[PDB]
Write a protein that binds this ligand. Structure first.
Ligand SMILES: N[C@@H](Cc1c[nH]c2ccccc12)C(=O)O
Ligand SMILES: CC(C)=CCSP(=O)(O)OP(=O)(O)O
Length: 355
């Protein structure tokens, strides 16, 4: 009945799929409740605490599973830690920053990169659609990896490009902005905080009407990923035959920068919002397991994860599987990520057709 109790039940069942110990599970359920603030105790019969863009039903939680061949998926959870402040973006941002800085203190990492950007991303009268989200990578040992997501449009959508250009300059990535491919918008900037082999600055780009061929040409990273693999992923995720475009909710690309010498990204991820291109989650699950099997990943663990989040039949709604992503990063194996919704407030109805 309370938001924190649904969310921590779902997290608990997901930690089991990910193979985390009881100790680490208990740790991370605590962290999730702390991240929700007063909203953790909010009855689910009341409206969401904010009209957050984090999920379609405004649950301020979303999970994701990152798959590699030969092992269990890695589990991650995305939260709006200022959600208890509601829809006032300045107050929601201030509360979210306070949560991240509490995490940084607790786990002993620096926020200097974030702090350098604060005035760009947290102006006095910010514009939507978000102020601050946080994702936690739920690593064995109970000390998570921390990622923060900021709004390039905070100073107005017309200033998003300028804001991203300035952020990249402040972080020392003076060639990165001009390395990005063209796009239709800059919806997010994200930072890896804390202990990472190579922490990334991540720039997210929106592409309206992307085709399969476009999905394989948009990488800017060195070395370039396989075009054929990207095209096939896009076709499978959108159910496009071998014209065909994703002209509803747009596909996004993410370009990651981890070192400043090359001037080039070290990563590219293609994100397909599959929820807008299926009749129901049985179709989205079928597409997700097709991608997983193509890349020699553990699709039965996805099936277990879906049942961990929700007991409903997959065909009784749409939006449980929010996004599918194919992830390339320099010197790392290709990874597939599935983003799974909490559906604490609504189950969107199934569709008779997808036009
Ligand atoms: N729900 C938002 C943000 C979001 C949540 N999970 C995501 C995964 C990938 C990309 C964006 C997102 C959107 O649809 O854009
Ligand atoms: C939450 C949003 C905006 C995007 C999801 S991309 P991500 O941060 O999950 O990507 P990684 O798994 O960190 O590469």
């Amino acid at each position: 009945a309370l938001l924190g109790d649904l969310a921590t039940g779902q997290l608990t069942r997901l930690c089991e799929v990910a193979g985390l110990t009881e100790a680490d599970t208990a740790a991370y359920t605590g962290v999730l409740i702390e991240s929700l603030g007063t909203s953790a105790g909010r009855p689910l019969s009341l409206p969401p605490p904010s009209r957050t863009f984090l999920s379609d039903d405004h649950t301020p939680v979303e999970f994701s599973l990152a798959f590699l061949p030969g092992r269990a998926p890695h589990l991650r959870v995305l939260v709006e830690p200022g959600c208890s402040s509601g829809d006032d973006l300045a107050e929601n941002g201030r509360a979210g920053l306070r949560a991240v800085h509490t995490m940084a203190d607790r786990w002993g990492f620096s926020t200097e990169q974030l702090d350098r950007l604060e005035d760009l991303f947290f102006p006095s009268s910010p514009e939507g659609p978000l102020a601050l989200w946080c994702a936690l990578e739920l690593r064995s040992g109970g000390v998570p990896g921390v990622k923060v997501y900021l709004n390039p449009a905070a100073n107005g959508a017309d200033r998003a490009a300028e804001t991203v250009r300035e952020a990249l300059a402040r972080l020392g990535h003076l060639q990165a902005f001009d390395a990005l491919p063209r796009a239709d918008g800059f919806p997010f900037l994200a930072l890896d905080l804390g202990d990472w082999d190579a922490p990334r600055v991540k720039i997210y780009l929106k592409h309206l009407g992307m085709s399969a061929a476009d999905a394989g040409s948009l990488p800017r990273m060195s070395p370039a990923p396989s075009r054929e693999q990207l095209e096939e992923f896009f076709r499978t995720a959108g159910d496009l035959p071998a014209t065909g475009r994703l002209a509803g909710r747009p596909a996004l690309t993410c370009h990651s920068f981890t070192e400043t010498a090359t001037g080039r990204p070290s990563g590219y991820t293609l994100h397909v919002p599959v929820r807008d291109y299926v009749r129901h989650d049985g179709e989205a699950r079928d597409r997700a397991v097709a991608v997983l099997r193509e890349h020699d990943m553990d699709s039965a663990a996805l099936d277990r994860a879906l049942a961990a989040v929700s007991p409903r039949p997959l065909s009784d709604g749409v939006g449980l599987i929010a996004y599918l992503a194919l992830v390339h990063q320099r010197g790392r194996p290709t990874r597939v990520t599935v983003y799974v919704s909490s559906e604490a407030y609504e189950v969107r109805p199934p569709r008779e057709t997808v036009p």
